[PDB]
Amino acid sequence: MEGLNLVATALAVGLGAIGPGVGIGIIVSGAVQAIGRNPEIENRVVTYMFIGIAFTEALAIFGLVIAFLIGF
Amino acid sequence: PITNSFVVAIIIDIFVIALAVAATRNLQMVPRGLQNVMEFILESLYNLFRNINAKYVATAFPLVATIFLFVLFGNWFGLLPGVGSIGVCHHDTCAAQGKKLVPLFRAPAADLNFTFAIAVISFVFIEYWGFRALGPGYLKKFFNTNGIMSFVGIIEFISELVKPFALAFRLFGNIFAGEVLLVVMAFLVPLLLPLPFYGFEVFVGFIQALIFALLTYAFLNIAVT
């Protein structure tokens, strides 16, 4: 086909955010709930939440750059 | 030129003006009637806004109330009989001399023109009031302030811009979907079938009307923060 690369770009973009979005949501929810349970652990909880979010963010960028390669 | 939805929008505005005139014609303590209901609605809205942010609860309160009243009027007009059945002509009643039988009453929210004005007004109010008491800090990205914090700020900036457009698109989709669901239920059966959906339509419209004002107040508070 001729527009199949466009479908590939869509699949890379669409499937590259399903996992990371849910992971970020779960991480933020757990961090906020823990902070509400104990405020004093705020600094370390925020740091670990940032690390976890950064992992999934890089995982989404993995698909984003592949889509850009096809897009460019 | 004008479209069908413009007439319904003008009718909603005229009805709002008439209701306000009726309420304000006899203004007195211990109201009982239409004035009492209007005062109760206004007081509940003011309480909800003060729950969000009392500092700016009365800042754009008239604009928010006008938007909410217009949305409620448009939602009520959508489920009313005569909308979508009377055709102006530019088997159907207008089968002879076919001109698509343009509906006389088109919901103001069921169009991308009337809905877009609310988004622009909300975005302008948020940017103005947000930057009124923040200057560069309202849209400050915090460039490498907290270990490349600019990435978080840039992403959040697009969300704030898309929020008013998202709200307008949500209102337009809700209105159009309500009208289309009514039409589909009418096509399915001639009577008594659309009861589960027609009743839910009014509740959905009221919920959306309240939610638009609540979201505007919350966005203003977030902008003020």
Partner: protein, 38 residues
């Protein structure tokens, strides 16, 4: 149209049926607010 007329009749009947029940509690709430005004 006959279908349009029937749909309008059904919609009006449903609206009235919902409105009576809603207004009953709404009338009670309005009366309570008027009483609590003073």
């Amino acid at each position: 149209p006959t279908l349009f007329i029937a749909q309008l009749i059904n919609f009006l009947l449903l609206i009235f049926i919902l409105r009576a029940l809603l207004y009953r509690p709404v009338m009670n709430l309005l009366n309570e607010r008027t009483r609590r005004i003073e």
